[PDB]
Amino acid sequence: MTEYKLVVVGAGGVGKSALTIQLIQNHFVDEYDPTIEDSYRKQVVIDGETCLLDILDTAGREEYSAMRDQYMRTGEGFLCVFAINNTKSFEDIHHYREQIKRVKDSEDVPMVLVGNKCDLPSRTVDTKQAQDLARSYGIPFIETSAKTRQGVDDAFYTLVREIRKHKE
């Protein structure tokens, strides 16, 4: 059983914790309880293999930015999450990707672009915008809803596959 060190990143309130708690506990956290940092562990089957997911749920609040360097060193793949109704969180992705490449000293780091809250009406970030960003970064782009569970498994399983190829 291969362990995978996933890190969920993104601006405050985009749904990083809700996506994680949905994946591992199958329930939707309705209240906004801002994260500092929490670790989770979930065993799954992806492409006929048993793997353990080591998931770090990080803080979007800028006040805790001093924790980023340490978790970008140890993590192996990054779920970069924005909310489809938060233009700033989409723009923040550039800044996360840059800091990750800096700390990894590499232009090829496993990551997946996640546009969350797709259950909502009147998104301010259209799909075409996010596709072009992800294509330019050379990473997958998956639309999710932590509330309905749409795309949650797909987002985490795709990141596992990205880490799988980088190691091999």
Ligand X SMILES: Nc1nc2c(ncn2[C@@H]2O[C@H](COP(=O)(O)OP(=O)(O)NP(=O)(O)O)[C@@H](O)[C@H]2O)c(=O)[nH]1
Q: Residue ranges for the binding site for GTP? A: 10-18, 29-35, 59-60, 116-119
CB atoms closer than 10 angstroms to residue 160: 21
145 makes contact with ligand X (CB under 6 A): yes
Q: Angle, nearest 10°, between helix axes 87-104 and 127-137?
A: 10
The DSSP string of 129-162 is HHHHHHHHHT--EEE--TTT-TTHHHHHHHHHHH
Q: How far from chain centre, in Å, is Cα 127?
A: 17
The one of Mg ion, ligand X, none whose footprint includes residue 145, by CB under 5 to 8 A per kind, is ligand X
C-beta of residue 99 within 8 angstroms of C-beta of residue 73: no
Binding mask 104-133 for ligand X (x = CB under 6 A): ------------xx-xx-------------
Check binding of 95 to ligand X (CB under 6 A): no
User: What is the smallest separation between the CB atom of 65 and ligand X, expressed in angstroms?
Assistant: 11
Per-residue binding letters, 27-66, with Mg ion (x by CB under 5 A): --------x-------------------------------
Choose which of 10, 11, 14, 17 interacts with Mg ion (CB under 5 A). 17
Say how far apart CA 112 and CA 6 lie, in whole Å.
10
Asked if residues 13 and 32 have their Cβ atoms less than 8 Å apart, the reply is yes
Residue 135 beta carbon to ligand X: minimum distance, rounded to whole angstroms: 23
Q: Does 149 bind ligand X (CB under 6 A)?
A: no
Contact set with ligand X (CB under 6 A): 10, 12-18, 29-32, 34-35, 59-61, 116-117, 119-120, 145-147
